[PDB]
Amino acid sequence: ATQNVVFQTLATASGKLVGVVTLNVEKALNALDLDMVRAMTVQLNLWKKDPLIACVVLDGSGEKAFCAGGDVRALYHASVAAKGQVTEVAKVFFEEEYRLDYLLHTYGKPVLVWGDGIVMGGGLGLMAGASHKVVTETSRIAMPEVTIGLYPDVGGSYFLNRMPGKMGLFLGLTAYHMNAADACYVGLADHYLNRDDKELMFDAMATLDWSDSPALNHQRLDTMINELSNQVDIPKGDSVLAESQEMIDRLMAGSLTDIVTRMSTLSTDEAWLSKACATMLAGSPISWHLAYIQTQLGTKLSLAQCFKWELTVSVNVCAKGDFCEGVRALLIDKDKQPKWQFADVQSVPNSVIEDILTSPW
Secondary structure (H helix, E strand, O other): OOOOEEEEEEEOOOOOEEEEEEEOOHHHOOOEOHHHHHHHHHHHHHHHHOOOEEEEEEEEOOOOEEEOOEOOHHHHHHHHHHOOOOOHHHHHHHHHHHHHHHHHHOOOOOEEEEOOOEEEOHHHHHHHOOOEEEEOOOOEEEOOHHHHOOOOOOOHHHHOOOOOOOHHHHHHHHOOOEOHHHHHHHOOOOEEOOHHHHHHHHHHHHOOOOOOOHHHHHHHHHHHHHHHHHOOOOOOOOOHHHHOHHHHHHHOOOOHHHHHHHHHHOOOOOHHHHHHHHHHHHOOHHHHHHHHHHHHOOOOOOHHHHHHHHHHHHHHHHHHOOHHHHHHHHHHOOOOOOOOOOOOOOOOOHHHHHHHHOOOO
């Protein structure tokens, strides 16, 4: 098997079991790779149909991260080799990760994610579907795909559009680092604890009155977290995003052209907002188009339809987008000097975007 993800069951006073998944590459901040994706889908699928299993928990080894993103190394390398040609490596990577995220949203039984610390990219993808999304004083959550020439995938096509006003667009453009307050506000988190409550949360699961009804167990699990939640020693405080909603709807209004001019035009003494600007403006112009097109998708598509659309775009940006230069600059060569295939927003030819949107199958 793989050692990068580990499974065990927590026994409970009721006789039911809680299945616990632990991502285990503390070295790479629990970065999600395909072996993990396979072992997890294999074990989750077994657990889903097992009547002893009442609930599933996802968490990550060490203190720093639940999961900081996908491991895009082997995807970077395959992609470059084939040089403008879609690859089975990509197809397999995305298809299978997306099946995993999908399985998590429609799990039936509760899935609790211990979203303490860093949760980004693919990591955010594992979390975003869960029924019981837990964050802590240390949670930092983001989709930085735009900085490496991808876009906010792993179901973002579905979840981003469902957030207040233009929030999902801003998050995808800017790779804004949300805290626990921010994550609750936008609906990426359901519950707030503190890190040093992990032990008590597991104690409480062992003694929870687990039943044979998924929906009742959902309710009991919320109530359960709810009580531990009044007892946090460190408050989540205020959401910067929530307090800036109207200003963020303004900055994100109109066409992508307005936004890019607005963003590159603004000055502000708000550190959070000026790094957001600078992060957006340094990322892939192709990425800005993709994030922006996602918002035109509206909310009609089912979850499964968003993933199908993403498998197409992801597979195509790796081949023809800025992703390879992105991953060369931040990850392999580490000079963080991307030279993007196109310079600015206008320069990305519409026939490039259109090709990226079209099924290579």
